[PDB]
From a paper:
In Coronaviridae, including the betacoronavirus SARS-CoV-2, the causative agent of the COVID-19 pandemic, the macrodomain is part of non-structural protein 3 (nsp3), a 200 kDa multidomain protein encoded as part of open reading frame 1 (ORF1). Evolutionarily, these viral macrodomains fall within the MacroD-type class, which is primarily composed of (ADP-ribosyl)hydrolases that are able to cleave the protein-ADPr bond. To this end, we obtained the crystal structure of the S2-MacroD bound to ADP-ribose and its analogues ADP-HPD and ADP-HPM (characterized as potent inhibitors of the related poly(ADP-ribosyl)glycohydrolase (PARG) enzyme). We identified and characterized the structural basis for the observed functional diversification of MacroD-like enzymes and provide for the first time direct evidence for the hydrolysis of PARP14-ADP-ribosylated substrates. These data suggest that SARS-CoV-2 contains a conserved, enzymatically active macrodomain that can potentially counter the host antiviral ADP-ribosylation process catalysed by PARP14, as well as alter poly(ADP-ribose) (PAR) signalling, thereby enabling viruses to escape the innate immune response of the host.
Residue numbers in the entry: 206 to 379
């Protein structure tokens, strides 16, 4: 019922990847945890964050505003667990560094560390879009940091092929 993932490519024992839209995957799989690539104020404008919020008919944004009002912003590299609304049981909002604003790229390791508190997650590549991190570097940090089962949704077919191709070089390099 829950967590019925299909059609993924196995990269390691715990990291999987698929050329798919993350919202479509969540609707098909009804996962326990879906990952949002967030900013510290939980303002869902564009990217994965906008996609998930629209699919919840803006419920995610209202909940986030309420969370922020009570608790204040997240830290870069931090996370919070909120409702997954109609897409998942829970949504893990993770804030990767915004390299375009000069934030420290090493904090991407902190962001993916949050994945290790959940048995299985559907997730995007953190900081690889609006936040300006290299998608390949984001995959490297994911692969090196996450010990739990992470299912990565990469919607662009050209990016998917480049990531898989670059991953092979990473394994044979050392
Ligand atoms: N709907 C999508 N399904 C699967 N993958 C997606 C989807 N939309 C974007 N992506 C990809 O997921 C990766 C992460 O991109 P973003 O969603 O912009 O995340 P990020 O760079 O951490 O920036 C977070 C900001 C925080 C808010 O301002 C809105 N987005 C990139 O490779 C995107 O091309
Ligand atoms: Na699936």
């Amino acid at each position: 019922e829950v967590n019925s993932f299909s059609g993924y490519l196995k990269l390691t024992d715990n990291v999987y990847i698929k050329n798919a839209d993350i919202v479509e995957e969540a609707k098909k799989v009804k996962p326990t945890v879906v990952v949002n690539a967030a900013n510290v104020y939980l303002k869902h404008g564009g990217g994965v964050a906008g996609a998930l919020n629209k699919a919840t008919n803006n419920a995610m944004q209202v909940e986030s505003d309420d969370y922020i009002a009570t608790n204040g912003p997240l830290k870069v590299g931090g996370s919070c667990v909120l409702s997954g609304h109609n897409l998942a049981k829970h949504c893990l909002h993770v804030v990767g560094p915004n390299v375009n604003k000069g934030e420290d790229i090493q904090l991407l390791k902190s962001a993916y560390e949050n994945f290790n508190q959940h048995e299985v997650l559907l997730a995007p590549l953190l900081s690889a879009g609006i936040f300006g991190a290299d998608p390949i570097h984001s995959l490297r940090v994911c692969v090196d940091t996450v010990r739990t089962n992470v299912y990565l949704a990469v919607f662009d077919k050209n990016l998917y092929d480049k990531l898989v191709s670059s991953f092979l070089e990473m394994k044979s390099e050392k």
